[PDB]
Design a protein around this ligand. Structure first.
Ligand SMILES: NC(=O)c1ccc[n+]([C@@H]2O[C@H](COP(=O)([O-])OP(=O)(O)OC[C@H]3O[C@@H](n4cnc5c(N)ncnc54)[C@H](OP(=O)(O)O)[C@@H]3O)[C@@H](O)[C@H]2O)c1
Ligand SMILES: NC(=O)c1ccc[n+]([C@@H]2O[C@H](COP(=O)([O-])OP(=O)(O)OC[C@H]3O[C@@H](n4cnc5c(N)ncnc54)[C@H](OP(=O)(O)O)[C@@H]3O)[C@@H](O)[C@H]2O)c1
Ligand code: NA
Ligand code: NA
Lengths: 488, 488, 486, 488
């Protein structure tokens, strides 16, 4: 075990006053990684009062002073990339080959990006007439809250905290109870970089208690949430009933990958693989509906199976391991229920469909890489997000058909097309109802690129210049230099 | 008495299938203006299918073709200004001296503004490397819904529909049951201007039925709401619980007007009057907490009393009338309950405080212009929005005190300061927690100026370039021209 | 009667005592005698512009927007009348002038009218006690100098952003094509533009154009024309009074036909890239690079399409090819055609004046195509500004990029290919400001256009050009106590 | 005396091939600081070919890779601040109290600012119709040239090279022959930070030879020039005659300082001192026309005299020295001719008017702090930039007059007003024809704030986001996905 994990409030670790704890499990072994204290209602109020004090100090600094502090945190994150990745691997089950290459690297990339943009955050000036003009300030919201998910814990903490801090706010962050550990490390790193006390506080806890207290607190101006649709609805509802808050939500999806009639099938299979089996399928943007032309289906299926042969499950710290267990045993039970529904509805199982067995697997939350084919639009595994390593392959005949079927979903997060044809690529992409679209690739999410969902996949965006601005609020100021006229 | 008012769906009036109606009255006389049909659940669904069909036509046109149609609607609104003002006066009770100068004029100003901006709505292009780049599209949300309030019915309809339509969306608009008539005229005007059938549908009805159906419909992408906090919470809950929707809300406030120690008291009194008694106090941005230095309070009160004597209640179509009844008898009752709480909590009644009586008043929802003084921060009339003609005068001593008291509220809509001093004006305004700030004036809301609330006074903004962008959704598109690498 | 100057909302006699003649290039007859603005006329126009600019800038943004939109409405109403005049003055067929010249000029005015209210400064917080805000102020009086190939379009593309940004503009049309600019000045006044905000000074470049470039109270010059005159303008502006200068100077733009291109599509693009306005378009794709394996078939497709060109009565619905703008310009184009023959280019079609009844009296040059061209030929290196296409064989993609870029010009370029990677990959490597994929010639009001290298300075159209007609004033408000070290 | 200084081309010092040298003088002693090689026509061509090669390497890197390299150069500049400040003091005569606090600090501030903005440099995307769209790229110009002035040598070098490099260009920089030394140090620092060889080359030389060779070279795409009007005309002419190049110029001015009738005269005097005698009056933005109300003129003069009496001329490396000699003895001769013209034209000499004398001054190019009063608008010292420590005080009666007289100049660089009144401050500033305006202050030039001249004081701007964009050129790209129609 690790030492008991405490709350992080005002630049130090502190015990919760709730009397409550929870355990985070190592999904490779089933053993308790750490006992973690859960923030109660009083702890949340302490954190808000801490955040209000730190935010004022932070906002009073110059823009470049803030930039330098966030840049110092970047420098530390680069220095400690491997240490943090190992902790993320223990907490999440994702292979070290992923966490050491992606999770901290791309989280720190977004922090570095926003650090450089702070001096460029500007309001406007609007002349009305010789005797009057308007100017605007992009002011901090104040205290904002982030609620993270368990698939990319520190990356999510960085993608929410970076624009929030760069915009002059304090953020209170609640990591998922499944994966609370790296967020506490991030808090220490920020303070070491010189972040003022209270500007980034971390409250581990359960969604139903700590998360609810955050969403209900009257002095929190904005909630940013990553997770599933079901929890998103609770968060949105509670934020409205209790105290009005701006809200950002990234909620996953059922993203379609469209393989065109002129696609190279090796390229198409490589993209489909990376869109389904990275992080053991636990990625919001995964292309879990793979639409393949009927004329290519059989050959595509054989290419996918060949690549499934390249998946290497094993020791998560071994260099050649590229597939992990799922994040938790309850999550695995849910994925197995989806797989069983696929079988009972007649989807054709090409590989996988069961847990992994044997030495080194019996005690971990492993699900084999699973591919179904001959899938149809009404199947449960086609309609619902599984968030495991389960690819659904669907045949199609014509371009208008596949666009309709790709869009006939309540989800809207990502989409992609594989085609060498100029007109086909742009023409199809422009008709797809998704916020993140990839042409002849999958998964790259540059700091510069706004990402978020259409329809039930989200509200608002993350990354890009617009997200820095979305963590400010506009104040419009009219200077009236002429004589004021009253009609009374 | 007008003919029975029908729903407006797909470029024509159509009967509701709900079997339900309501009546709108003239609040100055109690006479029934019209029987109005109320949209049922099936009517809403028909309106959404109409909007989906029209939106596709509208979005496929060129940007300048859309601009020209909205400009033609501006032209018609200018020509019919006085006619529409008369109807608005009948429906709302606001004096014709206001409705003919403000309501349609500023609503049409915003439509005119956005009409010219359609061709400037652009995405971005982000170079990643020689072999890859990103571009973004600002795509229409699709079908959006607007929910109006009764204090500025046609202006609210124009401020919501103008950016929504200019961004390429269709809007379904539900006016308040208290004041449904001008929204129906607006629907006819848009069709006359060449707006494609279905792009602006109008569904009169009750909030508890028609409004809820709109917030719950799965194919509406965004709700924009103007009204009170209680109804906003209901709207937010239903919009999230049913189908995730973007949400904008303007919810009123308790805005402070700060008279500085160096202010001219004639200017201060004129601003305070215009900040409290325009539209009979039924304005979201009204400066209903008037902070006056103790050394000036008695003279300030005398100047307010002089100006209150100039308030001219009477025939709403007479040019010199500058004060009307409240919009409804239920609303006047709420204002009267607040007046009674002010008296019972020890506030000093400076003037007013009762219903108006006599010929021309007995049948209308008239309340005398009312001023309380000797107020303290804990009184109900100081803490809560009244939305009638009730000014609360508070004394203060020093600048730090007045800033703290001005900000000690859950609301955040507007604020203002009266001072000739350069440093004092900008220094105080920058510390106030409000989205709309006026220096040496009150009430002007240019089309260019984003307006909306901090804290519990709202979510999002209206007007300005940013609100056009807020009625689009960003699609990010990565073009990968290099070879894609899979780790499988 | 002589056509007069337009100063302060009325036609007024020049004080120069000087005139020139504009010719109808289809007949050689004098279309009109036009007065030429002298140095005193320029000074009068500047004082008029200074007075009108102050009125115009004091109006609200939306008031300015409405006035420019009224001018758009008048241009739409008078489209056909103005097009007939442009045809008389320029020789371009009415099928062109009535479809493009006023239509696209008015498109740009309409665009900027709607963008005026969006012209905003910025606000920068420095610290609690100080902030900066900026204003985008008008330059004041600006000058535009037009060319003869698109006279009223050029007047509108220059005046629209200048006026929308709150400036007055003094506009000098080319002496070859002065008439439509004078009609535009009347239309602006009719729309409610304040007197002096748009003045028109016909004259010669060597006199009126020089006087404008030298005047001390003109804040900016925007110039369209040739490189030779562009240097003269730049030289005179430097000697006299510091001014911002924007320039669009033509080019030798390459059209790259890829190995996977459909040759009917490529030939159609090549035709529109070379023979619209009788080849008198700055952005024309006059170096057509064709894969060697496609060359013979492409040449046949070009020969078929060139043979179908309908030269004739400029007001006839089916005419799609006109004479050149002037007889001196025709002589210059014929010298280039002769250099192509004498330097060993193979003449595929055309190469001479058109002859016979209906052509003998006009400045006609046949649509002309050379092939077997090489990069050292004069017709390949120098802008001809007539209907002269140069077809060049190439073997490899890297080769054609080198050759496309091996020019001092940089105005436009294009590629014909159905391949996603090829289209973007090639375009990103071309050194040109205006790039077309599987098309040619469309110039949306939203799209900034201008040249790399010797093809220009600055841009026209797009939001950025509205801003380029303002100057930034930065204003710091210091609310804290100022510290002096003395 | 230092070693002979070489050219800096392609990441190393290299001998000039011109066979020519020049000397830079220490203006405090008259001694030769160094012999410096002068770049010839062949040396410029070699530097251009070096720059073309390095620029391609630099532009091919990621935006953030470039950001990190420029940030490393910032880090080195901070560490070497005192070393560089001392060299600048020796070369320019400016007190170390200035060079160690302002010159490198604000030069590095601008580099740090642009380093963070590189990832935010974006093109646009414009939808035309379903079958066609436009996108733009902001491409590097290629090789650009900067020509520096002698009053702020390393700051000018940083203010030009920072946006040029951040936009992806290589820059060839020619420092003034009076002050060539710190630009050579900067070149070494860029290489140490990882700037690719050739991206920043430095060519000392004479304006008439090296500068002209740069302005004439056919493969240089843009010239950025700081200096006087006379040389700016030479640069403009030669740049046009040779090869069309974008040219940016900052050319000094005769900037007005307007003291309002309600101004505190101690504040006004302090502002006037800082606007005239910093860097011994050798500042482009100096407020050398000080407009004072007639009723306050005598008292203002008495306040200026006391403050002039506190000026501490002496050892330039002593902490309490705040006034230095002029940059050169030829420049002093020109300033003394202006002073004599003031005397002969009837201006009243309030103080100074001569060189400083005595031990420690006889060998330096010192001019006493000089104030003229009773000045008139036709006087030479009022109309022409002196670039020495010479203040002209002009009386005025009313606001409309002083605005007219402030604007009655061919120059337009800066301006300021001193007033506590809100309306007066904004009203006056909005009417002044200058690009840089200060209210109740003088001299601060934040990296965020675009700076440059109206009228004869310059073309284009420096600093601010816009200057980064001005070092790119726009490429517009239309994608036509529909069938192209030819009319032939
Ligand atoms: N970029 C383009 O779209 C464009 C347009 C036309 C021509 N060109 C090229 O230019 C070549 C020469 O044609 P051109 O000589 O008729 O055109 P040009 O001289 O470049 O005409 C451009 C404009 O500059 C004016 N101008 C001439 N000398 C001037 C001076 N010293 N100061 C100020 N303004 C001056 C001209 O006045 P006047 O015409 O009254 O003398 C005209 O208004 C053509 O063969 C073609 O290659 C390019
Ligand atoms: N705007 C400012 O901040 C500033 C700065 C300094 C001076 N000035 C003004 O300029 C006046 C004259 O001083 P100055 O003559 O020493 O300054 P200057 O000539 O304007 O110096 C500016 C720069 O231009 C270079 N230069 C000169 N002639 C050139 C040419 N033909 N082509 C290219 N580059 C050329 C100079 O090189 P060399 O020095 O090697 O000859 C120097 O690097 C001063 O009295 C003052 O009013 C203004
Ligand atoms: Na865990
Ligand atoms: Na003519």
């Amino acid at each position: 075990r690790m030492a008991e994990q405490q709350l992080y409030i005002h630049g130090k670790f502190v015990a919760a006053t709730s009397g409550k704890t929870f355990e985070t499990i190592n999904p490779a072994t089933g053993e308790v990684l750490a006992t973690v204290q859960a923030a109660g209602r009083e702890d949340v109020d302490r954190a808000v009062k801490s955040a209000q004090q730190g935010q004022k100090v932070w906002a009073a600094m110059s823009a470049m002073a803030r930039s330098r502090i966030l840049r110092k945190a970047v420098d530390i994150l680069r220095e400690r990339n491997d240490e943090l990745a190992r902790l993320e691997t223990l907490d999440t089950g994702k292979p070290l080959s992923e966490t050491a290459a992606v999770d901290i690297v791309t989280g720190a990339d977004v922090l570095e990006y926003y650090a450089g943009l702070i001096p460029a955050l500007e309001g406007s000036q609007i002349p009305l007439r010789d005797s009057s003009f308007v100017y605007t300030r992009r002011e901090p919201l104040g205290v904002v809250a982030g609620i993270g998910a368990w698939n990319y814990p520190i990356q999510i903490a960085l993608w929410k905290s970076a624009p929030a801090l760069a915009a002059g706010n304090a953020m209170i962050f609640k990591p998922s109870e499944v994966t609370p550990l790296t967020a506490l490390k991030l808090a220490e790193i920020y303070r070491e970089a010189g972040l003022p006390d209270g500007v980034f506080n971390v409250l581990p806890g359960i969604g139903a208690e700590t998360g609810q207290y955050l969403t209900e607190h009257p002095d929190i101006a904005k909630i940013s949430f990553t997770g599933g649709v079901a929890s998103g609805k609770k968060v949105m509802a509670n934020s409205a009933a209790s105290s009005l808050k701006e809200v950002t939500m990234e909620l996953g999806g059922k993203s379609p990958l469209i393989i065109a009639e002129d696609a190279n099938l090796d390229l198409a299979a490589d993209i489909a693989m990376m869109a389904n089996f990275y992080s053991s399928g636990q990625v919001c943007t995964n292309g879990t509906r793979v639409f393949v032309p009927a004329k290519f289906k059989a050959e595509f299926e054989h290419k996918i199976l060949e690549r499934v042969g390249r998946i290497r499950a094993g020791d998560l710290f071994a260099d050649d391991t590229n597939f992990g267990p799922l994040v938790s045993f309850p999550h695995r039970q849910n994925v197995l229920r989806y797989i069983e529904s696929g079988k009972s509805e007649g989807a054709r199982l090409l590989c996988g469909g069961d847990v992994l067995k044997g030495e080194g697997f019996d005690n971990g939350a492993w699900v084999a890489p699973t591919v179904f084919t001959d899938c149809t639009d009404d199947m449960t595994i086609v309609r619902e997000e599984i968030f495991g390593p389960v690819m659904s392959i669907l045949s199609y005949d014509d371009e208008a058909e596949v666009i309709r079927r790709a869009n006939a979903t309540e989800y809207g997060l990502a989409a992609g097309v594989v085609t060498p044809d100029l007109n086909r690529a742009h023409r199809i992409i422009h008709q797809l109802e998704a916020g993140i679209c990839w042409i002849n690739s999958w998964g790259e999410s540059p700091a510069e690129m706004p990402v978020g969902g259409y329809k039930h996949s989200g509200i608002g965006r993350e990354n890009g210049v617009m997200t820095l601005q979305s963590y400010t609020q506009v104040k419009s100021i009219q200077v009236e230099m002429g004589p004021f006229q009253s009609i009374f």
